[PDB]
Amino acid sequence: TTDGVYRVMTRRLLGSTQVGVGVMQEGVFHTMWHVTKGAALRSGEGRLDPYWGDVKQDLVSYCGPWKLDAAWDGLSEVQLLAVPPGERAKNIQTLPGIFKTKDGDIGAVALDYPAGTSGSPILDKSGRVIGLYGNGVVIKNGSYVSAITQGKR
Amino acid sequence: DMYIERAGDITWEKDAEVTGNSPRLDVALDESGDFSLV
Ligand SMILES: CNC1Cc2ccccc2C1
């Protein structure tokens, strides 16, 4: 239950497989819906039950409501704390681009990691989580760009 | 059945590697939560 970044694992496939990542903050676990499909999670001998989720936002929280409310400032570089399958956590600094939608603008990071890295946090210079990595699009040249996906608190 | 394993603290790293560009893209988000290019 300590604050920090966590791997989401399953043993129902061959070996142990990392299906994603998430953030423990203020007693609540935060990840992307497509990682868990809203299923319960085990932490040691304890169980974490889903509390809130939304397929369209592609987010889910466990044990309480969504706690992360920092937002990209629109101007400064950020850091992806990528936690790739089988690999040490590592910070990658980048200047976000922008997803333009009919409903407004969203920051986006042009960084490409395995699908199991979904749910890794994106941070501002104060260390606050401004969103989660892993819901995005493939652009004309074939590379991957993730929205900075943030919930509501 | 899914389980979680701690991987680190959430902190800004002062001398992190810098990379990636900054594309401005028109996108649409469908009811299934999938983004597409416009
Ligand atoms: C083709 N994408 C690569 C990017 C990456 C980074 C760490 C580990 C694995 C991989 C797959």
Numbering used by the authors:
A (entry chain B): 18 to 170
B (entry chain A): 50 to 87
What's written in the study?
Here, we present two crystallographic fragment screening campaigns using a 96 fragment sub-selection of the European Fragment Screening Library (EFSL) provided by EU-OPENSCREEN. The performance of this subset was validated in two fragment screening campaigns using the model system endothiapepsin (EP) and the NS2B–NS3 protease complex of the Zika virus. EP is an aspartic protease with the catalytic dyad formed by Asp35 and Asp219 and has served as a model protein for finding inhibitors for other aspartic proteases like β-secretase, a key target for treating Alzheimer's disease. As a second and real-life target, we addressed the NS2B–NS3 Zika protease which is crucial for the viral life cycle of the Zika virus but with its shallow active site challenging to target.
For soaking of the NS2B–NS3 Zika protease crystals 40 μl of soaking solution containing 0.1 M sodium acetate pH 4.6, 0.2 M ammonium sulfate, 24% (w/v) PEG 2000 and 5% (v/v) DMSO was added to the reservoir. 0.4 μl of soaking buffer was added onto each dried fragment and incubated overnight with one crystal. With this campaign 18 fragments were identified as crystallographic binders with a total of 22 binding events. Out of the 22 binding events 10 fragments are binding in the S1 subpocket of the active site close to the catalytic triad forming π–π stacking interaction with Tyr161. Eleven of the binding events are at crystal–contact interface sites.
